[PDB]
Amino acid sequence: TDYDALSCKLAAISVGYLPSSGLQRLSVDLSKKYTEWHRSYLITLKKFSRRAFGKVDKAMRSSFPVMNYGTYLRTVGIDAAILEFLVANEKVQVVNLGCGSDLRMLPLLQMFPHLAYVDIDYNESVELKNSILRESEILRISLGLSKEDTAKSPFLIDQGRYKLAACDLNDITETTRLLDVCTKREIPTIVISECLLCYMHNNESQLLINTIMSKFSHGLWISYDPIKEKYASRWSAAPNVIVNDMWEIFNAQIPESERKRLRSLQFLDELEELKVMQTHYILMKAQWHHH
């Protein structure tokens, strides 16, 4: 089901939905890299695991236009909130909780030179991600890694401004130990729980939100999950909380020439199948400021 995130992302790139140069703000150079980084991740997946390649290859090509619209709003909806925070603050650090197979750090590191980034998943999850980034040549050059495994402890990658690491997020001891050594308190901090909290119980997820919000002074928490007032309540300690289902993001945040561009690639005869599905997915932004 991390494979559902990667299969969706490759189905959107193949049709043309992503990369959107308007919303994500990617040049012709960085849009050529966005497509070549994901496709080099799929080809490298075939080497280390032919079963994992078989699930992602069959799901990508069998994805319908409805499912590709939901992936397009999933990517540019989160990215839009990231770009507002990375322009208002230049020295920023990220903590993508449940990162999985996400490669938004690759374009984000080139655009913002003073951007730290921290990826966190299970031991079985980041072991496969680490092998793919160290094997592919284009993914090696972008992160500035040599083929050697000079990294150390649970830190599978640790080359300057990017750091991959294994950690059970349910175990709060491993999570806070990890954030002490790799991040800083006062530095502005985006936390990204993309399709993560649906796997955890309400006890462990609420402890993860209270502890991470506490350990940083200034920050923004972009979340995304299946199910909106009940979901947004979890971050009530933060004084400013917006919350919106993905049908509301489709109308409000997606501008007019973007609507015509997606219609030109694959026309979605009826917007009803898109509304029913996307009202059951949402997107939460939560900005808190200590001092």
> Which residues contact ligand SAH by CB under 6 A?
1-2, 5, 98-102, 121-122, 125, 168-170, 194-196, 199-200
The contacts of residue 104 (CB under 8 Å, 6+ apart) are 75, 78, 79, 82
Tell me how far apart the alpha carbons of residues 161 and 158 are, in angstroms, rounded to a whole number: 8
The whole-angstrom separation of Cα 148 and Cα 2 is 26
Q: What angle do CA 230, 287, 70 make, to 5 degrees?
A: 60
Are 103 and 41 within 8 A, CB to CB?
yes
Q: Smaller CB distance to ligand SAH: residue 107 or 260?
A: 107
Nearer to ligand SAH, 30 or 194 (CB): 194
Q: List C-alpha distances in Å: 276 to 5, 230, 251.
A: 20, 19, 14
Identity of the residue, 85 or 224, whose beta carbon is nearer to ligand SAH in the bound complex: 224
Residue 119: which H helix or E strand, with range? Answer: strand 115-121
How far apart CA 159 and CA 8 sit, in angstroms, is 29
We find the least distance from the C-beta atom of residue 124 to ligand SAH, in angstroms, to be 8
Pick 154 or 217: Cβ nearer ligand SAH: 154
Q: Is 194 annotated as a binding residue?
A: yes
102 known ligand binder: no
Shortest Å, Cβ 223 to ligand SAH: 10
Binding site annotation covers 168?
A: yes
CB nearer to ligand SAH: give 74 or 134: 74
* Annotated binding-site residue? 273: no
Distance of closest approach, residue 18 Cβ to ligand SAH, in angstroms = 13
The CA distance from 51 to 55, in Å, is 7
Question: Shortest distance, CB of residue 215 to ligand SAH, whole angstroms?
Answer: 17
Was 50 annotated as part of a binding site?
Answer: no
Task: For residue 160, say whether it is annotated as part of any ligand binding site.
Answer: no
- Which residue ranges make up the annotated binding site? 74, 98, 121, 168-170, 194
- Which residue ranges make up the annotated binding site for S-adenosyl-L-methionine? 74, 98, 121, 168-170, 194
